[PDB]
A paper describes a structure:
The 3C-like protease (3CLpro) was named because of its similarity to the picornavirus 3C protease. It is a cysteine protease which shows a typical chymotrypsin-like fold containing two domains: a β-barrel domain and a β-sheet domain separated by a groove where the active site is located. The active site is characterised by a catalytic dyad (Cys139-His30) or triad (Cys139-His30-Glu54) and shows a strong preference for a –D/E-F/Y-X-L-Q-G-P- (X can be H, Q, or E) sequence corresponding to the subsites S5-S4-S3-S2-S1-S1′-S2′.
The structure of native SV3CP has been determined for the first time at the near-atomic resolution of 1.3 Å resolution revealing a crystallographic tetramer. Indeed, in the native enzyme, residues Met107 to Gln110 occupy very approximately the same positions as the P5 - P3 residues of the bound substrate analogue and the sidechain of Arg112 occupies the position of the P2 sidechain. In addition to the movement of β9 and β10, the β-hairpin formed by strands β11 and β12 also moves to some extent. These effects open up the active site, suggesting that a fairly marked conformational change occurs upon binding of substrate. Mass spectrometric analysis of the purified protein yielded a molecular mass of 19,290 Da confirming that the protease was indeed fully intact at the time of crystallisation.
Numbering used by the authors:
A (entry chain A), C (entry chain A): 1 to 172
B (entry chain B), D (entry chain B): 4 to 123, 131 to 172
Amino acid sequence: APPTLWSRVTKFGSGWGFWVSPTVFITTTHVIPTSAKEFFGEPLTSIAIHRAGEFTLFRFSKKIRPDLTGMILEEGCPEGTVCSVLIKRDSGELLPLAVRMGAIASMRIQGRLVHGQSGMLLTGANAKGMDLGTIPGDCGAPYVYKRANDWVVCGVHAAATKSGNTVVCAVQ
Amino acid sequence: TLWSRVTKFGSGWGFWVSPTVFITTTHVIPTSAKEFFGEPLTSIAIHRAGEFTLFRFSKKIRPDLTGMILEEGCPEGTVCSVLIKRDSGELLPLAVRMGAIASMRIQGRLVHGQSGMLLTDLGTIPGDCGAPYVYKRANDWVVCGVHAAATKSGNTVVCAVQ
Amino acid sequence: APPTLWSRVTKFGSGWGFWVSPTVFITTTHVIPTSAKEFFGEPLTSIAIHRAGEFTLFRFSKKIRPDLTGMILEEGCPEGTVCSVLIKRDSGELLPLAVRMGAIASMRIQGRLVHGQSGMLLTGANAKGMDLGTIPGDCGAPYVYKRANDWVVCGVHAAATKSGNTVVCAVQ
Amino acid sequence: TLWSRVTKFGSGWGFWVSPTVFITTTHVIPTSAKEFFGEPLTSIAIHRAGEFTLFRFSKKIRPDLTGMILEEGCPEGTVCSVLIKRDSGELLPLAVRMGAIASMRIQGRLVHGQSGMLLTDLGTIPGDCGAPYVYKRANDWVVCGVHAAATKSGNTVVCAVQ
C-alpha cells in the first residue's frame, strides 16, 4: 500500500484509527477510552461524533492533519473485492494483510455480538496468531482497496474468529 | 458413487446419508403432500432446524447404500465440494472454502448457516438448493450440510447445518 | 458446457477424442490402438496424421461429421485461464471438471515422462478418485474455455498425479 | 517471530532454520566473497542442489532462535505462505496452493522445483527471490523451500526444494 495511506494510520486508545481527511478520523468504537473528554487537544464540544455500532467517525472543527488530502470513504465494498487491512506491528513493520470480502453478517465472536462486512484472509491456512493473522491490538486498522486510479477506505477492523480465518470490518 | 445419493426432490435436491436418512434444504420441500418416496408421512420422522431438514424412514428406501458420517458444519478453511446436479445430466462438483457460522444478508434475506467462498458452468443457480457439501477426511467422506443460498455474484454461499 | 461441445466428445480406443470440425479429430496418442489401420471406415492412406508427443491430430479427406461447424483450436491457453475438461462417465452423466491452467511442464507421473500444459483442479481438496477427479479412462477428453462469444479447444487430457490435484493437457 | 528469521542476502533474501542453518535461492548468492555473516567460507558447509542452497555454520550465528522443521517440499493441495519482505518495511505473507514437482518454462527459462498458484500489493516481484515457503501442521511450523521463479502474470510460482 502507498506511503500516504500508512501516514494516516494512527495509534489510538487500545488500537488504531485512520485520517480520511484533515478533519475526519474513523476508528472502532470499543478502542476509544470511555472516560475520554479530549482528542488531539480539542474538547468534545468542538467535535461532531457519529457512532453506528462498532463504527465511530470524529469530525473536527479545526484541521488537525493539514498535510493530508481528503479521500473516498464508502459503506463497505462489493462481494469478492480483495482489500488490504493496514496493520502496524512492533518495530516499524507494516503488514497489509490481504482479505477477500463477503456478505454483511451478524456473528457471536468470543464474548461479543458483532455486525459488519465479513471477509476471509488470503495469508495462509496459517492465520491463527500474529505472524499471518490479526491480534486484538489490531482493532481500528483500515480496510482499503484500489479502484481504477483511486484508493478507497471502506471500514475498520472490529473482530476475528478463533481460527483467524474470518474477520469483520465495521462499516459506516 | 457419492453422486447416486444426490436425488431430485421438490423445487431442488437432497442427499441419502444412509438407507433410512435423507437431508435437504427446508424451503425446497413441498407444502402439499401425503407421502415421500412412497412412504406415508406417519412412517417418517421429520426434524427441521431452520433451513436444514432431516427425514428418518421406518423402512430402508436405499438399501444399496452404506451409512456415511454426517456432522454440523466443518472447520474454517476446509475446502468442501458442493455436489450439484443439473437436469441436462451435468454433474458440477464446485470447490468452496468454508468460513464462520453467521446470520447473513443474502439478496435482502437473512439466512443462518456456514458461509463459504467459491475458488472459481463455474457457479450455483437457484434450482441447485439442497445439494450436499462434502469433503474427504483421511479415508472417510463427510457430509456437513445442504446448499441454502447464494449472492447474485456467486462468490458467497451459505451451507445450512444440523 | 454447451450441448454442441458434448456432441463432439467421442468414445475412442482406450479413452476419448474430439471433433474440431467435419474433417479434424484430436486425441491423446497413447489411447490409439497400435495395430489400427482403419478409422471411421477410412484407410490410413486417406488420412493425414500429425503426432507431437501425446498430442495426435487426424485430418480426413472426406467430411466424417458434416453436422458440425469448424471451431478454434489453439496451442494451450494463458496462465490463469479456467478450463473445463469434458469427461463422460458411466450412464449419460457429463462431468465438466474445472481446472486452473498453469505453465508448460515436464514431469514424471507413475511410469511415464509427460510434457504439456499443467493445471490444478478446482473440484475439491477432494480429487483422489472418480467422484471429483480424473481416472485413466478419461485420457483424450478436451480442455475448453469461453473467450468473449467464442468457445476454444486448447488440448487433450494426458495425465494426472497420484493425489489427483495436478493434471497435464497435451498441446498442438 | 518467523519474520525475524527472513534476512536480506545478496540480490534477495534467505531464512534461518536454526542458529547454524541458513537457506536461500542459489542465483541470489554473491559470486565474489571471502565471508558471509562475518564467518570465513572455510568455517561454512555449503550444499547446493539446483536453485536450493543450504549453509551450515561452525558457530551459532543466530543463538536467539530455536531449530524448526525443514522438509523437501510439501503434499499437493497444501496452502503455504511465502514470507516476502520489502525494503519499505512491508511484510507480505502471500497464500499459494502447492502442486507437483516439475521442470517448468518460466519466462523462457527451465526451473526445477514445486509449482504453486497464488490465491489472490498481492504478488511477487523479482527482488523477492529466496523468501521461504512455510505452513502450520498441527502445532508446528514447517519450512519446505525457497522462492525461485514466477511468471509475468503472477498466478504460477516455483519453490526450490532440498
